[PDB]
């Protein structure tokens, strides 16, 4: 009925949704070994071509996996350095605050990438820092953060690197071992194109082993969760969203079928550039300069025409089969358009026609 | 392919699973107002016929909702009294331990009902106690714990009552306002017969308001989660398992269609008693005395025959289309058979025949 131009939950394929039509026993080998362990094996290979990495799946929103990571990896004497250049960086700082973890935020503003010099200064002047966290694609704006240089600075300073790759993993090629990422967090329902229900963490085994007995939550105990999947071959300590896990197994088959992350990245990148060019031709202005754009989601300034109203514009697009997204920038009047999920170049072209017809104020 | 004789995830109906075939936007009023708020309204009415109650839905396993409750309701100076007569009472004590909440466990054996005198002695001698927790149906054994006298004792001592009704709500009639339950926790995928993905808490509005600013987790911040659903009419702070929420909306329609909790209780109770009589005719002995049996799941002693092996027995039943469940009692060799989900008296009759054919040792 509608194409969801969101950062996820998004428009999944018919086969991803159809995979949810079977019930599973959570104590059954058919689920744990043949579904869960297969997902786990595939996820590590998607994240890195190197050895020494492992995966852990965690029930709940992606925030629950970010929180499981922060609350399990950081010891009682630990201190986090976070890049806060949007709502998901601010949420990482908010998690640290809830868990009574000292936190230093480097805040370049929501329309700017962090200055490496600023990160370097924080790392050199604050020896108490033990962990660094960064958001790969800052979904608030669709900004692509410079994770390589940031992780390189962090590792040269002997810190543990946490990457929030919620809106990037599966859509932007990365090798987390090569980048020096210790814990990479991502979603079931963004670039992998599964359905919501759980998140996951791909971690350096040695760094994940340090999490033992450190967790601030039972549900979000990362080592305990991983240990059970290890010893009990896929077994989730507590009930898992079985149907959504089976839908994710299907999403992984479709990602391979598409040609992997490299091919998915090309489709997304093409959709996003075609979208930006189309929007500009209609007079829309992107929030960010093109060099900062991710190929995932794009924020645009709201038109300044006095009759412009997001809800009326949103409604007119929905009537044409497109669901766009609200803006998330505190100091700007803006909207977002995602281009992930069942979004192909033909859809972007149809969307550009739909935006034009939706421009009732023109 | 198999009938899941588990306590949940279980065999859901075709319509419950088919309801998962549509994608939803998490920022869309159709999802929030017409699905989420409808579920919320229905859940409170199922829990009580009285005013002053409200519901909160929480992503994750049911354990995440139990943890959200404990970590949000208990203040910094708070103390929990828990009845631990199975794994779920022990898990509540384990949550308190993780959250650094002082915890007193009144721990009877797993084959005995809670001793009211022990709870009363704890309450009278430990003034520091602020909260009491009890499991309604202790799924470990299938015990139906008396909750009315326990809740009455707790209220007479001015404590906040937390009920783990994970395997009972929707299958055993209760009015949480009449029982004096402050927070009742249940599952999407047990007696309501939805699919896993989230849990929920039905709470006395005034008791839930005391949770503000006390959470030990962002993801599991019960007040914050509720407040957003209140002010933003169904809006979940972070991504919700949309498809599973829509499947749950369908499960609620089917519960109504069956004739409500009273009719579901009758079917479950009948399945359970027929099962017990059938198992006894085959020489199986229930772990618990009949007066303690819940109508949800039943523990049976493992046959003493030297050739009996759970896995071989389980495999032979699976070949006949039945998935039975492992024992969870620490001090007895048992197995379990659930009778919830798409389990009807005809299935119990067919299962008794299948049980007989799988008795390879005789």
């Amino acid at each position: 009925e509608y194409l969801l131009l969101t950062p996820g939950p998004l428009s999944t394929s018919e086969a991803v949704r159809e995979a949810m039509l079977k019930d599973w026993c959570t104590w059954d080998d058919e689920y744990n070994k043949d579904i869960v362990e297969v997902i786990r094996t595939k996820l590590v290979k998607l994240a890195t071509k190197h050895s020494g990495y492992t995966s852990v799946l965690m029930q709940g929103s992606g925030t629950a996996s970010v929180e499981a990571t922060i609350g399990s990896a950081i010891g009682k004497e630990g201190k986090l350095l976070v890049v806060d250049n949007g709502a998901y960086g601010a949420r990482i700082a908010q998690i640290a605050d809830y868990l009574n973890i000292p936190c230093h935020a480097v805040s370049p503003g929501e329309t700017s990438q962090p200055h490496l010099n600023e990160v370097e200064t924080a790392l050199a002047s604050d020896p108490a820092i033990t962990h660094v966290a960064i958001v790969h694609c800052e979904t608030t704006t669709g900004m692509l953060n410079p994770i390589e240089a940031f992780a390189s600075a962090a590792k040269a300073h002997g810190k543990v690197v946490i990457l929030d790759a919620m809106s990037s993993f599966g859509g932007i090629p990365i090798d987390i071992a090569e980048l020096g990422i210790d814990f990479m967090i991502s979603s079931a329902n963004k670039c992998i194109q599964g359905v919501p229900g759980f998140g996951f963490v791909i971690a350096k085994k040695t760094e994940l082993e340090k999490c033992q007995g450190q967790a601030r939550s039972l549900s979000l105990d990362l080592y305990d969760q991983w240990h059970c999947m290890e010893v009990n071959h896929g077994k989730w300590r507590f009930t898992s969203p079985t149907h959504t896990v089976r839908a994710f197994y299907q999403a992984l088959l479709e990602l391979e079928q598409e040609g992997g992350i490299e091919a998915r990245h090309n489709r997304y990148q093409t959709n996003q550039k075609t979208l930006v060019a189309g929007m500009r031709s209609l007079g829309f202005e992107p929030l960010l300069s093109d060099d900062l754009h991710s190929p995932i989601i794009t924020s645009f300034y709201s038109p300044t025409h006095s009759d412009y109203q997001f809800k009326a514009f949103y409604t007119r697009l929905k009537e044409q089969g497109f669901v766009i997204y609200p803006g998330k920038v505190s100091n700007a009047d803006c909207f977002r358009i995602g281009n992930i999920g069942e979004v192909y170049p033909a859809d972007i072209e149809r969307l550009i026609g739909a935006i034009e017809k939706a421009m009732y104020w023109q």
Side-chain angles (χ1 to χ4, degrees), chain A residues 48-69:
Chain A
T48 186
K49 61 174 134 297
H50 302 270
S51 63
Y53 283 72
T54 192
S55 65
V56 45
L57 323 181
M58 178 62 64
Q59 302 94 318
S61 69
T63 299
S65 286
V66 178
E67 190 168 344
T69 306

PDB file of all heavy atoms in Angstrom, chain A residues 48-69:
ATOM      1  N   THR A  48      33.384  -8.634   9.184  1.00  0.00           N
ATOM      2  CA  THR A  48      34.818  -8.708   8.995  1.00  0.00           C
ATOM      3  C   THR A  48      35.213  -9.963   8.257  1.00  0.00           C
ATOM      4  O   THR A  48      34.557 -10.985   8.404  1.00  0.00           O
ATOM      5  CB  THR A  48      35.557  -8.614  10.361  1.00  0.00           C
ATOM      6  OG1 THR A  48      36.968  -8.558  10.102  1.00  0.00           O
ATOM      7  CG2 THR A  48      35.215  -9.779  11.336  1.00  0.00           C
ATOM      8  N   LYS A  49      36.309  -9.893   7.496  1.00  0.00           N
ATOM      9  CA  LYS A  49      36.870 -11.057   6.812  1.00  0.00           C
ATOM     10  C   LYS A  49      37.966 -11.688   7.703  1.00  0.00           C
ATOM     11  O   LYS A  49      38.567 -12.707   7.329  1.00  0.00           O
ATOM     12  CB  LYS A  49      37.420 -10.668   5.419  1.00  0.00           C
ATOM     13  CG  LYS A  49      38.537  -9.649   5.426  1.00  0.00           C
ATOM     14  CD  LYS A  49      39.096  -9.440   4.015  1.00  0.00           C
ATOM     15  CE  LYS A  49      39.277  -7.987   3.665  1.00  0.00           C
ATOM     16  NZ  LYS A  49      37.984  -7.255   3.659  1.00  0.00           N
ATOM     17  N   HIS A  50      38.231 -11.064   8.869  1.00  0.00           N
ATOM     18  CA  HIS A  50      39.275 -11.491   9.798  1.00  0.00           C
ATOM     19  C   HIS A  50      38.737 -12.383  10.914  1.00  0.00           C
ATOM     20  O   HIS A  50      37.528 -12.473  11.127  1.00  0.00           O
ATOM     21  CB  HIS A  50      40.019 -10.265  10.371  1.00  0.00           C
ATOM     22  CG  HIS A  50      40.655  -9.398   9.324  1.00  0.00           C
ATOM     23  ND1 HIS A  50      41.952  -9.621   8.889  1.00  0.00           N
ATOM     24  CD2 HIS A  50      40.148  -8.335   8.654  1.00  0.00           C
ATOM     25  CE1 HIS A  50      42.186  -8.701   7.964  1.00  0.00           C
ATOM     26  NE2 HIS A  50      41.135  -7.904   7.786  1.00  0.00           N
ATOM     27  N   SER A  51      39.640 -13.050  11.619  1.00  0.00           N
ATOM     28  CA  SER A  51      39.263 -13.923  12.725  1.00  0.00           C
ATOM     29  C   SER A  51      39.263 -13.106  14.033  1.00  0.00           C
ATOM     30  O   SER A  51      39.635 -11.938  14.031  1.00  0.00           O
ATOM     31  CB  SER A  51      40.228 -15.105  12.808  1.00  0.00           C
ATOM     32  OG  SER A  51      41.537 -14.639  13.087  1.00  0.00           O
ATOM     33  N   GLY A  52      38.828 -13.720  15.118  1.00  0.00           N
ATOM     34  CA  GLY A  52      38.813 -13.080  16.427  1.00  0.00           C
ATOM     35  C   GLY A  52      37.529 -12.374  16.800  1.00  0.00           C
ATOM     36  O   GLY A  52      37.448 -11.816  17.890  1.00  0.00           O
ATOM     37  N   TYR A  53      36.527 -12.387  15.906  1.00  0.00           N
ATOM     38  CA  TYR A  53      35.236 -11.753  16.153  1.00  0.00           C
ATOM     39  C   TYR A  53      34.128 -12.761  16.372  1.00  0.00           C
ATOM     40  O   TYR A  53      34.232 -13.924  15.986  1.00  0.00           O
ATOM     41  CB  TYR A  53      34.901 -10.731  15.053  1.00  0.00           C
ATOM     42  CG  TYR A  53      35.667  -9.436  15.235  1.00  0.00           C
ATOM     43  CD1 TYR A  53      37.036  -9.369  14.992  1.00  0.00           C
ATOM     44  CD2 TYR A  53      35.042  -8.304  15.737  1.00  0.00           C
ATOM     45  CE1 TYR A  53      37.761  -8.196  15.233  1.00  0.00           C
ATOM     46  CE2 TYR A  53      35.744  -7.117  15.946  1.00  0.00           C
ATOM     47  CZ  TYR A  53      37.102  -7.064  15.692  1.00  0.00           C
ATOM     48  OH  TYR A  53      37.767  -5.871  15.886  1.00  0.00           O
ATOM     49  N   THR A  54      33.077 -12.316  17.054  1.00  0.00           N
ATOM     50  CA  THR A  54      31.929 -13.120  17.444  1.00  0.00           C
ATOM     51  C   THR A  54      30.706 -12.229  17.502  1.00  0.00           C
ATOM     52  O   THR A  54      30.833 -11.006  17.532  1.00  0.00           O
ATOM     53  CB  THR A  54      32.232 -13.821  18.789  1.00  0.00           C
ATOM     54  OG1 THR A  54      31.234 -14.815  19.039  1.00  0.00           O
ATOM     55  CG2 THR A  54      32.334 -12.822  19.983  1.00  0.00           C
ATOM     56  N   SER A  55      29.518 -12.833  17.485  1.00  0.00           N
ATOM     57  CA  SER A  55      28.261 -12.076  17.545  1.00  0.00           C
ATOM     58  C   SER A  55      27.415 -12.494  18.730  1.00  0.00           C
ATOM     59  O   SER A  55      27.518 -13.616  19.237  1.00  0.00           O
ATOM     60  CB  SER A  55      27.464 -12.236  16.251  1.00  0.00           C
ATOM     61  OG  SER A  55      27.070 -13.587  16.106  1.00  0.00           O
ATOM     62  N   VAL A  56      26.562 -11.583  19.149  1.00  0.00           N
ATOM     63  CA  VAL A  56      25.575 -11.773  20.204  1.00  0.00           C
ATOM     64  C   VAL A  56      24.313 -11.099  19.752  1.00  0.00           C
ATOM     65  O   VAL A  56      24.366  -9.952  19.330  1.00  0.00           O
ATOM     66  CB  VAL A  56      26.035 -11.346  21.635  1.00  0.00           C
ATOM     67  CG1 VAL A  56      26.735 -10.015  21.692  1.00  0.00           C
ATOM     68  CG2 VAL A  56      24.914 -11.433  22.658  1.00  0.00           C
ATOM     69  N   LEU A  57      23.191 -11.814  19.805  1.00  0.00           N
ATOM     70  CA  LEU A  57      21.874 -11.241  19.467  1.00  0.00           C
ATOM     71  C   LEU A  57      21.170 -10.870  20.766  1.00  0.00           C
ATOM     72  O   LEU A  57      21.299 -11.587  21.766  1.00  0.00           O
ATOM     73  CB  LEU A  57      21.010 -12.203  18.643  1.00  0.00           C
ATOM     74  CG  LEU A  57      21.733 -13.074  17.605  1.00  0.00           C
ATOM     75  CD1 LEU A  57      20.730 -13.943  16.880  1.00  0.00           C
ATOM     76  CD2 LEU A  57      22.491 -12.220  16.610  1.00  0.00           C
ATOM     77  N   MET A  58      20.443  -9.743  20.753  1.00  0.00           N
ATOM     78  CA  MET A  58      19.806  -9.212  21.945  1.00  0.00           C
ATOM     79  C   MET A  58      18.385  -8.735  21.620  1.00  0.00           C
ATOM     80  O   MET A  58      18.224  -7.899  20.732  1.00  0.00           O
ATOM     81  CB  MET A  58      20.664  -8.051  22.474  1.00  0.00           C
ATOM     82  CG  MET A  58      20.082  -7.345  23.710  1.00  0.00           C
ATOM     83  SD  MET A  58      19.930  -8.411  25.156  1.00  0.00           S
ATOM     84  CE  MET A  58      21.743  -8.817  25.511  1.00  0.00           C
ATOM     85  N   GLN A  59      17.379  -9.265  22.345  1.00  0.00           N
ATOM     86  CA  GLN A  59      15.949  -8.918  22.210  1.00  0.00           C
ATOM     87  C   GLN A  59      15.761  -7.436  22.486  1.00  0.00           C
ATOM     88  O   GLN A  59      16.464  -6.873  23.322  1.00  0.00           O
ATOM     89  CB  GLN A  59      15.092  -9.640  23.269  1.00  0.00           C
ATOM     90  CG  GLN A  59      15.183 -11.165  23.255  1.00  0.00           C
ATOM     91  CD  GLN A  59      16.194 -11.747  24.190  1.00  0.00           C
ATOM     92  OE1 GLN A  59      17.336 -11.253  24.337  1.00  0.00           O
ATOM     93  NE2 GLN A  59      15.836 -12.919  24.715  1.00  0.00           N
ATOM     94  N   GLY A  60      14.781  -6.844  21.823  1.00  0.00           N
ATOM     95  CA  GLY A  60      14.411  -5.457  22.073  1.00  0.00           C
ATOM     96  C   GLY A  60      14.754  -4.526  20.957  1.00  0.00           C
ATOM     97  O   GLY A  60      15.174  -4.947  19.864  1.00  0.00           O
ATOM     98  N   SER A  61      14.572  -3.238  21.234  1.00  0.00           N
ATOM     99  CA  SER A  61      14.912  -2.202  20.265  1.00  0.00           C
ATOM    100  C   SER A  61      16.450  -2.199  20.075  1.00  0.00           C
ATOM    101  O   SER A  61      17.166  -2.787  20.883  1.00  0.00           O
ATOM    102  CB  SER A  61      14.436  -0.854  20.800  1.00  0.00           C
ATOM    103  OG  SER A  61      15.227  -0.493  21.911  1.00  0.00           O
ATOM    104  N   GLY A  62      16.960  -1.518  19.046  1.00  0.00           N
ATOM    105  CA  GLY A  62      18.406  -1.408  18.889  1.00  0.00           C
ATOM    106  C   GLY A  62      19.036  -0.716  20.080  1.00  0.00           C
ATOM    107  O   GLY A  62      20.160  -1.048  20.482  1.00  0.00           O
ATOM    108  N   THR A  63      18.296   0.244  20.689  1.00  0.00           N
ATOM    109  CA  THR A  63      18.753   0.946  21.883  1.00  0.00           C
ATOM    110  C   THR A  63      19.113  -0.032  22.993  1.00  0.00           C
ATOM    111  O   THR A  63      20.094   0.200  23.700  1.00  0.00           O
ATOM    112  CB  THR A  63      17.731   1.996  22.308  1.00  0.00           C
ATOM    113  OG1 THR A  63      17.615   2.923  21.216  1.00  0.00           O
ATOM    114  CG2 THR A  63      18.151   2.748  23.581  1.00  0.00           C
ATOM    115  N   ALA A  64      18.360  -1.145  23.114  1.00  0.00           N
ATOM    116  CA  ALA A  64      18.624  -2.182  24.126  1.00  0.00           C
ATOM    117  C   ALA A  64      19.999  -2.836  23.878  1.00  0.00           C
ATOM    118  O   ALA A  64      20.730  -3.067  24.835  1.00  0.00           O
ATOM    119  CB  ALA A  64      17.496  -3.212  24.149  1.00  0.00           C
ATOM    120  N   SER A  65      20.404  -3.029  22.602  1.00  0.00           N
ATOM    121  CA  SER A  65      21.756  -3.557  22.241  1.00  0.00           C
ATOM    122  C   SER A  65      22.876  -2.513  22.493  1.00  0.00           C
ATOM    123  O   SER A  65      23.984  -2.869  22.942  1.00  0.00           O
ATOM    124  CB  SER A  65      21.800  -4.008  20.791  1.00  0.00           C
ATOM    125  OG  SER A  65      21.108  -5.233  20.624  1.00  0.00           O
ATOM    126  N   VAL A  66      22.588  -1.221  22.220  1.00  0.00           N
ATOM    127  CA  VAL A  66      23.543  -0.139  22.521  1.00  0.00           C
ATOM    128  C   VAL A  66      23.736  -0.120  24.037  1.00  0.00           C
ATOM    129  O   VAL A  66      24.863  -0.159  24.516  1.00  0.00           O
ATOM    130  CB  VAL A  66      23.049   1.237  21.998  1.00  0.00           C
ATOM    131  CG1 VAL A  66      24.051   2.340  22.380  1.00  0.00           C
ATOM    132  CG2 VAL A  66      22.871   1.183  20.486  1.00  0.00           C
ATOM    133  N   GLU A  67      22.624  -0.120  24.778  1.00  0.00           N
ATOM    134  CA  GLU A  67      22.657  -0.140  26.232  1.00  0.00           C
ATOM    135  C   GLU A  67      23.322  -1.403  26.806  1.00  0.00           C
ATOM    136  O   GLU A  67      24.054  -1.307  27.781  1.00  0.00           O
ATOM    137  CB  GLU A  67      21.255  -0.008  26.791  1.00  0.00           C
ATOM    138  CG  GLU A  67      21.324   0.228  28.281  1.00  0.00           C
ATOM    139  CD  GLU A  67      20.009   0.659  28.849  1.00  0.00           C
ATOM    140  OE1 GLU A  67      19.137   1.068  28.051  1.00  0.00           O
ATOM    141  OE2 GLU A  67      19.855   0.602  30.091  1.00  0.00           O
ATOM    142  N   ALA A  68      23.036  -2.581  26.227  1.00  0.00           N
ATOM    143  CA  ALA A  68      23.692  -3.841  26.641  1.00  0.00           C
ATOM    144  C   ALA A  68      25.187  -3.690  26.485  1.00  0.00           C
ATOM    145  O   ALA A  68      25.941  -4.150  27.337  1.00  0.00           O
ATOM    146  CB  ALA A  68      23.192  -5.011  25.782  1.00  0.00           C
ATOM    147  N   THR A  69      25.635  -3.029  25.402  1.00  0.00           N
ATOM    148  CA  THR A  69      27.062  -2.859  25.146  1.00  0.00           C
ATOM    149  C   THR A  69      27.701  -1.918  26.149  1.00  0.00           C
ATOM    150  O   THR A  69      28.682  -2.281  26.784  1.00  0.00           O
ATOM    151  CB  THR A  69      27.315  -2.424  23.706  1.00  0.00           C
ATOM    152  OG1 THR A  69      26.683  -3.352  22.833  1.00  0.00           O
ATOM    153  CG2 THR A  69      28.811  -2.324  23.391  1.00  0.00           C
TER     154      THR A  69
END
